[PDB]
Design a binder for this molecule. Structure first.
Ligand SMILES: [K+]
Ligand SMILES: [K+]
Ligand SMILES: [K+]
Ligand SMILES: [K+]
Lengths: 461, 460, 466, 463
C-alpha cells in the first residue's frame, strides 16, 4: 500500500496477470505493506515462455559484441542507480543500508560487467580425425532458461543468475522470492532500457511452489534454478578469530548460506574467546536499516523470525549455555518490526538441534574440542559441505587442515568473500578464475558436434 | 550351464552374494543358459561401498602419473585379450564377432589410454584478490561413484564410464545390465591384474531395478532417440543407401544413435528403395561367432518380442513393408532370437514406428518434397541425440546441419560418435581437448581456498 | 604545407625533437605536401623510453578492469571520430574514403574493444607438488615494448599492435611508416583524451631504419614488433566453381586498396577449359572499377601510396610485357586530367602467365593480377604450393569434399573457401577482419605481451644432500 | 681414446662428417680423452635438414596415439637404461653418480612421459562469424626445429627440448655442447629403437658457434631453442639452519654449475656471525671426491678451462678484499691433481661493485652480502642486469609474499631452492608437476595455426 500494485513483467513492459489474485510484500522493519504483488497464473507462464522464445531469437541473432555492449549499458545504469536500488532492497529485505549500498548492486553490476566481456570469447573446437575427415563443434544457446530468486540477496542473485544466461545468448524467465519481489522488477526495467530485447528477461511473481513448478514442468524451459564449521586453532590470534566468528554469524543478521555457525574453539582458549565475542556482540549496532549507522537489521520476515525464536528456545531446552541475546527486540519502534537480538550459545554438543540444523538467523553455536584431528572430524561430520574456515598463525598447519576439510569453499584467516562463480549472496571475491567464468558460460550453452566426411564411406554390408 | 555360477566382484576378488538368489544370462544365438548369476543384496551393496571407500583412499593418495601407469598396464592387457573378450561379448550379446573384435574392446581400451595420458595435465587456478589476499582452486575426486551398464555395448560402456572416473582418482561400483553381465566381471579382473587397488572397481550384478536403486539411495555414493537422416536430391544415392543401411542394421539395429527416420525426396524414392533392397539382400545373417557374419540375433528373446510387436504395429498402420518383417526360423536360427533386417516405406510422421524408438533392425523411409520441409520434420521430435545429411554441395551440407537440432551431427557419413559421449558403437578417432578435460571435470569437484595474509576487516 | 609541422608525441603531449631534421609526407593523389614531420634523434628515443618506463608503472598499478574501462573510452572516441580519422587516412594513403570510413578505424576500434573485454579473464595456475609444497604462476606486463607501423593500413595496424600491448599492462613506443605518419599521432591524442596515462603510448616519427634500430638496441625495450609477411598467395578456381563468384573474388583479391595488401591472391589458377570465359568475366568487372579521387566517396580504387611505389609497380608491369605475358587490361599509369598529378596505376591483368615469370614469382604490392591455367587438381595444388611464401590461399568450388580437401593440401596459414580477404584477428595484417576471434587465439596474443612469474612455496622441511 | 671416434647422427644412423675436423671430449675427473668427436660442416647441416624434412612427414602422418605410444616406448627404454646413461653422463660431465643416477635421466624421462600423454590433446577451434560463415583452425607442426644443448645438464636438456618438439609432431636437429656431447647420441639411438622415424631426431656435434649459426641461418629451420646472479635473501626472522641448508644447496649442488644458483646471499647484519658459522659447518662436511664413487656429493668442474676461469674469479675476490670464509683453491691432493677440482668456496663481507658479485661464475663460489633493512636488500637483489631467479627465507609468510611481489625475477622460491618450473629448459631439480595450460601451452608453441574460413552465403564485392 506504500507502492502501487506490482504487475508481471513480460515483453519489455508490465502486464496484468490472469489470476486476479495477489499477495503482500511486507517491510520487516515495521510490518507495513509495501505493495500488493500479482500471482502469475499458468496462462501467464505460457505467455512469458512464448515472449521469451521469440525474444531469444532476436538476442541470439545479434553479434557477440552487440550483446556485450547492451549488457555493458545495463551495468552503467546499475551503477548510476545504485543508491536508489539499495534503498528499495533495504525496504524489501530489511538489510541495513550500509550493506545494500556497498554490496548487493555493486557486486551484481561487477559480475554482469565481467560476463559481458566474455561474450565474444565463446568458441568451439576443431578435431582432426584422419586425412579425409574432421569434426568441428558449435556452442549454441540453450534457448529459454528459468531462474529462481533467493530472499536474502534478491537483486544480487537476480544479477548472478541472469548475467551468464543472457551473456550466453539465452532468454531467462525469473521468479523472485515471494518474500522479496521488488528489485527483480526494477532489474527487468533496467535491462529493457539498456536495449535488451523484449522477452529476454521476463519476471513472473508468484507464491508457494506453484509458479516455480510450472516453469519446471514446461518442456520449452531448458534449465532451472549449510552448517559451515569455523575452526579456531590453539595458535590463533584470538582477536582475529572473534572478529571472524562475529562477521561469520551476524552479517546480514545471520541470513547467509555460507555462515560459520559452528565455531570450534580449543578448550584452553574457551574462556578468553567467549569474553572477546561477548565484547564484540555488545557493541553491535542494531536498529532501523534506513539509518546509515545501523549494521544489524531485522530478519527478512515475521514467519522467519518465529522460526529463529523456535531454534533459540530449542537451544535453551537442550541445555546449551546462553552467552548473549536470546530474545526478540521489542522496545521503541522495534516491536513493530522483526528484530531478533544477536544470539550466542556455548558449551554446545553435536547432537543438539541448534548445532545440526541450519537456522538462517543470528545464532552462533560455540563448540569446545581437545585436539586438532577431532575438530576436523567433527567439522566434517555434517550432511552439508558448503564452506569451512580455519584461523591460525601457522600456515603450514592451515594448509594441512584445508586438505582434510570436506568443503567446497575454504577460508584461511578470513571469512565471507565467496567464489565469484557461485550464486550465493554476500561478500564476493573481487576476481574470477578464467576457467570458472568460461566454464559457467559453458553451462548455459549446448555443444553440437559436426563430423565432416570427405572420403569414401565404408559399410560392412 | 556353460560357465560356472558368476559371483560378485568386491575388493580385488570374487565373493559370495548374500541374497540366496540368482538369475540366468542367455546366449541369444541358441537360447542356451550361459551362466547363473548372483543377485546382490542390500547388504552386498553396503559391503561394496566400504570396500570402495577404503580402496579410493589408496588410489587417490597416488600421484596422477602413478595412476596413469597402472591404467596403461590395463590398456596393455585389454589389447592382449582383445579376441578373447570379444568372443565372450559375442556370446553374451549376440553381436557379430566381426564387430566385437574390432570395435568394443579396441575403442574402450583407446578411451582408457586417452584419459590416462590426459589426467596429469589437470591443474588448478590461482587468482590474486589484492596485495595481501588470493584464492586458488584444486580439483579433487568425488570419492565413490556408481556406474550403470548398457545391454548393447556392455564392455565398451563399462570402459567408457570407468576410465575417466578412475583416471580422476575415484572408485567406481559398477552394475552391468542383467541382460549382459559377463564382460564387466572380466574387466574387474583385468583392473586388479593391472595393479588397480582392491575396492577401486567393484562389480555388483542384479536383476531388475533394485541394485540400481540401492546405489542411488546410498549416502556415500557421490554420482536414446529417433535420429533423422536426410538424403538431399544431389546426394550420391549409392553412398546414401550405404549410409542408411549402416545407420539402421549395424549391431542388428541396437544402437542409440541409429538413423531410423530416413528422408528421401519424392523423385528419388523408387531408385533409393531398390538400392537399399540390394544392400539388405546381401546382409550376412548367421552365427555371430562366425567371423563372416555381419548381422546377429537381437540381445534377448524378450527384446525380440518387443521388436516384433513394433513390426506388427507398422503393418497395422499400413506402412508398406519393403523387406524383412519377421523372425528368421530356418535351420538353427529358430533356436536363436533372430529378426530379419526390416524396412518400412511410405511412412508418415504420426506412425508409431516413426515416433517411437524400436532398438531393433527396423528402418522407416519417409518421403519429402522440399528441403525446408525435410528439415522441419526431422526437427519435429522430443528426441535430439543425432542427425545426418547426405549431399555433395558445400553450402547445403553445412547450412542444413546447422539448422538440425541434435548434438551429434554427421555429413556424408554415419555412426562414429564423439569420444566424450558414453554412446556405444563406432567412436571418433580424435578427441577435443576441451571435451576431454570437461569429461574429467564431471568426475571431480572444485575446492576453492582463499587465504588472507593481511589484517581482517569487520563491520562490527 | 597543408598542415602544420608534426612534432613527436611523448608524455601525453607534443614535444620538439632534438634534431632539426624533418621529412615530408606527400598526398599521393595530387603530389601536394601534407606536412613536414620531425625526425627523432637517439636522445628522443631515450626521452620516450624514460617516459614509457614511468607511465607503464602507473598503468600497470591499475586493475585489469580499470585499464579495460579506459580502453573502452578510447573505443568510444574512435567511433565518434571515425569519419574525421578516415578523411585524414585517405589524404595520407590515397586510399578511397569508402574504404577508410568503413574498414580502417572500425576494425581497429573493434580489436581494441575485444582485448579490453578479454584481459580481465586472465588468471594464473596453481600446481601442488606434494602435501607441503606448491607452485603458482602469474602473468605480468613485459614493461615497455615497441611497435613499427605499416604504410598500407597505418591507423588500423597502430591499433592492432597497441591494443593487446596496452590491455596487458605494457607501454608502447610506436614508429609509424615515414610514408604515412599522420594518423598515428592522432591515435596518441585519443588515448590521452580517453585517460591513458602519460608515457603509455608514445609516438616517434623518423626516416629510414634508424629509429627502428635505436628501439631494438635499447635495453629497456623488452620486445619489438616489426611488420612495416610477404606473399604471392594463390587462388584456385576449380571447374565446378560458380564463375561469377570466382571473378568477384579474384578482383576483390587483387584490387582492393589498389592492390596494396599482404594477403592478395595475385596468382589466380583457372582450368584450361575455362580460361577464356573467366577472363571475360574479370575484364567486365575490371572495366567498371571506379578509379578516381579518393576523397570522392564514389571512388573505389585510388592512386598508389607514393610515387616511388608506383615506379616500382610500373617496373613489374614492364617485366610482364617483356616476358610475353598476355595483357588483358590496364598496364600503364593513368595520366588523364588531374590523375597526372597523382600516383595512379590502372587495374592490370596479365594472363597466359608461366610459373617462371618474374611477375608470377615476385610480390608486387600493386594492382597486378596474374592468371595461370592448369589441367588438373593435383597440378594446381602443387603449383600453388611451389613458392617461398605461405601467407594465404583460397579455393572456389561448390563441392563439399573438394573444398576442404584442397584447403587441407594448401600450405598457407590464412585460408578461404568461396571468399577472400576477411583475415583472422590474431594476424597483424590490414584490411577486412573476421567478425569473431577464437578464444585461444585471443589469449595467446595477450600472452605475447606478458611474462610468467613462477612462485614456489615450501611449507614443510627443506632437504639438503650436504 | 676411451671410445671410438663419434660420428654425426642423421636419418637414424651414424654418418661421417664432411669437415675433416674433430675435437676432443675430456673426462674432467682425470684428464683422460673420452673420445674424438666429428665436427659437422655446413654441408652436413644441409644433409641433416633434408633428412629432418622427410622424417617429419612420416612422423606427422601417424595418428596422435601412435606418436604417443612411440614416445612412451622411449620412456620405458630410458628407465631401463637409466644407470648406463647416468654412468656415461658422469664420465662426460664430472657430476657425481649420486646426482646423475637419480636426477638427470629420471626427470628427463618424466618430462617426455608427460608430453607423450598430451599428444592426443592437441586440437584447434571453431569460430562462428555469422549464420552463413564460420572459421575452423588446425594446429599443424612447425616442421623442422633446432635445439641447442647446455653443458651442465646434457641429457636432461636434450630431453627437455626434444620432448615437446616431437610430441607436437616436429622433427628436431639437436646440437649438444662441445663440452658434453656423448649422451645426446645415446638419446638419438633410443628414440630410433622406440620407433621414432629416421630423421625425426638428428644430432650434429660441433665446436665454437658454427653449427648453431648454420642452423639459425637455415631457411627450413622454423625455430631454434638456445640454452644470472640470482639473489637469496635471508630475512632477520629466518630459521638460520634452513637458511644455511638452502644457501649451501643453492651454491654447491652440481659443483655450483647451475644456471639458477643463488650466488648472491644477503644476510642481515644481526645474523651474519651465526649464519657464517652454520655455512662453515655444512661446507666442511661436503664430500668432494671421485664422481664414480656413490658416496661423493661434490665432483670436479665440467672442464679444465672452466676450472681456470673459476680460479681466476677466486683470485679476483681475494684481490678486491672480499673476506675468504672457506675453500678458495684448486684441490690437488692425490688423484685430485689429475682432475679439475675446485674446493667449495665462500666469500663474505662482499660489496656490490665486486667482480665476484657482479659477474656470473658458474662454479662453487658463494658471495655473502650484509644488509641493514629489507627494502635495501630487495633493491640490491633487483640491481643486476640478470633476473632469472630469486629466493627468500623467512618464517613470516606474509612478509615472503610481499617480498616476491617486489622481486623482479620470474622464478621465485620461498623457504626452498633448486626446483625450477617444468616449462623452463633449465637443468637441475624440477617441480614434480605441470599445470595444464602450460604443458598444453608449451605444445602450442611448437605448432602453428592454419585458419580456414568457410563462406556459405553470397560473396560481396565492392567492384
Ligand atoms: K518483504
Ligand atoms: K545374455
Ligand atoms: K603520405
Ligand atoms: K667432457
Amino acid at each position: 500500500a506504500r507502492f502501487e500494485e506490482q504487475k508481471l513483467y513480460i515483453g519489455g513492459r508490465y502486464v496484468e496477470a490472469s489470476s486476479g489474485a495477489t499477495f503482500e510484500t511486507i517491510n520487516p522493519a515495521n510490518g507495513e505493506v509495501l505493495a500488493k504483488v500479482q500471482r502469475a497464473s499458468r496462462e501467464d507462464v505460457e505467455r512469458a515462455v512464448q515472449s521469451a522464445v521469440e525474444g531469444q531469437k532476436v538476442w541470439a541473432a545479434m553479434t557477440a559484441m552487440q550483446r556485450s555492449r547492451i549488457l555493458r549499458r545495463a551495468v552503467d545504469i546499475l551503477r548510476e542507480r545504485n543508491d536508489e536500488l539499495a534503498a528499495l532492497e533495504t525496504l524489501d529485505t530489511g538489510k541495513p543500508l550500509a550493506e545494500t549500498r556497498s554490496v548487493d548492486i555493486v557486486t551484481g553490476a561487477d559480475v554482469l560487467e565481467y560476463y559481458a566481456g566474455l561474450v565474444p570469447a565463446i568458441s568451439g573446437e576443431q578435431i582432426p580425425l584422419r586425412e579425409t575427415s574432421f569434426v568441428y563443434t558449435r556452442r549454441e544457446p540453450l534457448g529459454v532458461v528459468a531462474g529462481i530468486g533467493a530472499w536474502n540477496y534478491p537483486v544480487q542473485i537476480a544479477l548472478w543468475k541472469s548475467a551468464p544466461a543472457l551473456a550466453a545468448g539465452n532468454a531467462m524467465i525469473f521468479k523472485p522470492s515471494e518474500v522479496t519481489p521488488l528489485t527483480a522488477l526494477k532489474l527487468a526495467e533496467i535491462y529493457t532500457e539498456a536495449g535488451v530485447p523484449d522477452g529476454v528477461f521476463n519476471v513472473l511473481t508468484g507464491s508457494g511452489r506453484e509458479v516455480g513448478q510450472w516453469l519446471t514442468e514446461h518442456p520449452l524451459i531448458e534449465k532451472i534454478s549449510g552448517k559451515s564449521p569455523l575452526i579456531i586453532f590453539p595458535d590463533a590470534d584470538l582477536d582475529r578469530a572473534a572478529d571472524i566468528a562475529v562477521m561469520a554469524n551476524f552479517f546480514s543478521s545471520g541470513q547467509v548460506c555460507t555462515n560459520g555457525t559452528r565455531v570450534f574453539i580449543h578448550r584452553s582458549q574457551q574462556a578468553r574467546f567467549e569474553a572477546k565475542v561477548l565484547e564484540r556482540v555488545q557493541r553491535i549496532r542494531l536498529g532501523d536499516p534506513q539509518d546509515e549507522n545501523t549494521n544489524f537489521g531485522p530478519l527478512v520476515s515475521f514467519p522467519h523470525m518465529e522460526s529463529v525464536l523456535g531454534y533459540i528456545e530449542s537451544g535453551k531446552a537442550q541445555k546449551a549455555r546462553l552467552l548473549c541475546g536470546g530474545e526478540r527486540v521489542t522496545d521503541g519502534a522495534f516491536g513493530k518490526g522483526a528484530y531478533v537480538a544477536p544470539t550466542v550459545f556455548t558449551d554446545c554438543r553435536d547432537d543438539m538441534t541448534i548445532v545440526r540444523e541450519e537456522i538462517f538467523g543470528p545464532v552462533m553455536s560455540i563448540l569446545v574440542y581437545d585436539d586438532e584431528d577431532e575438530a576436523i572430524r567433527r567439522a566434517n561430520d555434517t550432511e552439508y559441505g558448503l564452506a569451512a574456515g580455519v584461523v591460525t598463525q601457522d600456515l603450514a598447519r592451515a594448509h594441512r587442515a584445508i586438505h582434510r576439510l570436506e568443503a567446497g569453499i575454504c577460508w584461511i584467516n578470513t571469512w565471507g568473500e565467496s567464489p565469484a562463480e557461485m550464486p550465493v549472496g554476500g561478500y564476493k571475491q573481487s576476481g574470477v578464475g578464467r576457467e570458472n567464468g568460461l566454464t559457467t558460460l559453458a553451462h548455459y550453452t549446448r555443444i553440437k558436434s559436426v563430423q565432416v566426411e570427405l572420403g569414401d564411406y565404408a559399410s560392412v554390408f
